[PDB]
Amino acid sequence: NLYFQGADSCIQFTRHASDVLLNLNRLRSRDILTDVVIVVSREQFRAHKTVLMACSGLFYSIFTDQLKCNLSVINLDPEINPEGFCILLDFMYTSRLNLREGNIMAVMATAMYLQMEHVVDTCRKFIKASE
Amino acid sequence: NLYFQGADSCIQFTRHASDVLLNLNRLRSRDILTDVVIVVSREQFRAHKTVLMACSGLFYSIFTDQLKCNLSVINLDPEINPEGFCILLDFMYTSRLNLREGNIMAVMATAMYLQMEHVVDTCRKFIKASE
Ligand SMILES: Cn1c(=O)c2c(c3cc(Nc4ccnc(Cl)c4C#N)ccc31)N[C@@H](C1CC1)CCO2
Ligand SMILES: Cn1c(=O)c2c(c3cc(Nc4ccnc(Cl)c4C#N)ccc31)N[C@@H](C1CC1)CCO2
């Protein structure tokens, strides 16, 4: 019931990937093995570099750079809205995007900067439905 | 199409968790930001501590211990079969378990040791179907 025959030979566990992500978000909530602080304006966000790279073209580029991969603090562009970054950071660790009329422009601009392309496309579609 | 209305207010992205896990497995394949070596008998396996903790009660206990969380090399019980550990390490990063008649006893014993309880239950069910 919790597993099935995959297209390939292996048995596959249906909820495995979502349960791993839930545990990584629990580690983040408890500040366990977090290895970077992202600073956006006056706010700081602790996270795991591997989750950030897995969820963003900008962080993938930063953490694969031989000089920047060892930095413990990353400062983002001061024009980035911290609420918009917070919504996208929660999305990275949960798959859930808290998109609302009052935050959609900041979330879209932050997703463009972070290189989260399907999030940008989704924001655009929601904006287009209003116009 | 790639998203839906979650039971809660947020929109949710269907493939997000499995795509994050795919990227973490790509980082492992390329040896990027791996922070531990697990030694099983004569073999070494590089991995990310966060993925190991998220997938195992034993690694969760080790990496939350104030003394052991800083270790770069973890040596497992020499009775653990490296092929069995390799199959479970691949499962952690993919959701796919390569269970076969020739490896099921080693995979089950290694999952008991690593505290991966639904994997043990699944192994037991497959063994019971043969008897
Ligand atoms: C452009 N872009 C996205 O538009 C994007 C990304 C995204 C992720 C990456 N990282 C990688 C890519 C390839 N290979 C490796 Cl190893 C890595 C790593 N680490 C690079 C670019 C990415 N991740 C998604 C997550 C569901 C996967 C959310 C946001 O959308
Ligand atoms: C017993 N047991 C399992 O039987 C198990 C586990 C498993 C995982 C943990 N880690 C945690 C638990 C709670 N809270 C936190 Cl933060 C962490 C962490 N990190 C602890 C015990 C675990 N993970 C599954 C993965 C799909 C989640 C695969 C194997 O089955």
From Swiss-Prot, chains A, B:
What domain of life does the native source organism fall in? Eukaryota
Q: What induces it?
A: Down-regulated during maturation of dendritic cells by selective stimuli such as bacterial lipopolysaccharides (LPS), CD40LG and zymosan. Protein levels decreases upon genotoxic stress in a dose- and time-dependent way.
Tissue expression, as annotated, is: Expressed in germinal center T- and B-cells and in primary immature dendritic cells.
**Subcellular location(s) of the protein:** Nucleus
Q: What is the effect of changing S61A?
A: Abolished ubiquitination by the SCF(FBXL17) complex
**How is the protein modified post-translationally, according to the record?**
Phosphorylated by ATM in response to genotoxic stress. Phosphorylation induces its degradation by ubiquitin/proteasome pathway.
Enumerate the spans annotated as BTB domain.
34-101
Q: Which comment does the entry carry about domains?
A: The BTB domain mediates homodimerization. Its dimer interface mediates peptide binding such as to corepressors BCOR and NCOR2. Interaction with corepressors through the BTB domain is needed to facilitate the rapid proliferation and survival of GC B-cells but is not involved in the T(FH) formation and BCL6-mediated suppression of T(H)2 and T(H)17 differentiationrequired for GC formation.
Record's function text: Transcriptional repressor mainly required for germinal center (GC) formation and antibody affinity maturation which has different mechanisms of action specific to the lineage and biological functions. Forms complexes with different corepressors and histone deacetylases to repress the transcriptional expression of different subsets of target genes. Represses its target genes by binding directly to the DNA sequence 5'-TTCCTAGAA-3' (BCL6-binding site) or indirectly by repressing the transcriptional activity of transcription factors.
The record's note on quaternary structure and interaction partners says: Homodimer. Interacts (via BTB domain) with the corepressors BCOR, NCOR1 and SMRT/NCOR2; the interactions are direct. Forms preferably ternary complexes with BCOR and SMRT/NCOR2 on target gene promoters but, on enhancer elements, interacts with SMRT/NCOR2 and HDAC3 to repress proximal gene expression. Interacts with histone deacetylases HDAC2, HDAC5 and HDAC9 (via the catalytic domain). Interacts with ZBTB7 and BCL6B. Interacts with SCF(FBXO11) complex; the interaction is independent of phosphorylation and promotes ubiquitination.
Associated clinical condition = Chromosomal aberrations involving BCL6 are a cause of B-cell non-Hodgkin lymphomas (B-cell NHL), including diffuse large B-cell lymphoma and follicular lymphoma. Approximately 40% of diffuse large B-cell lymphomas and 5 to 10% of follicular lymphomas are associated with chromosomal translocations that deregulate expression of BCL6 by juxtaposing heterologous promoters to the BCL6 coding domain. Translocation t(3;14)(q27;q32). Translocation t(3;22)(q27;q11) with immunoglobulin gene regions. Translocation t(3;7)(q27;p12) with IKZF1 gene 5'non-coding region. A chromosomal aberration involving BCL6 may be a cause of a form of B-cell leukemia. Translocation t(3;11)(q27;q23) with POU2AF1/OBF1.
Q: What is this protein called?
A: B-cell lymphoma 6 protein
Q: Please report the organism this UniProt entry assigns to the protein.
A: Homo sapiens (Human)
Taxonomic lineage from the root? Eukaryota, Metazoa, Chordata, Craniata, Vertebrata
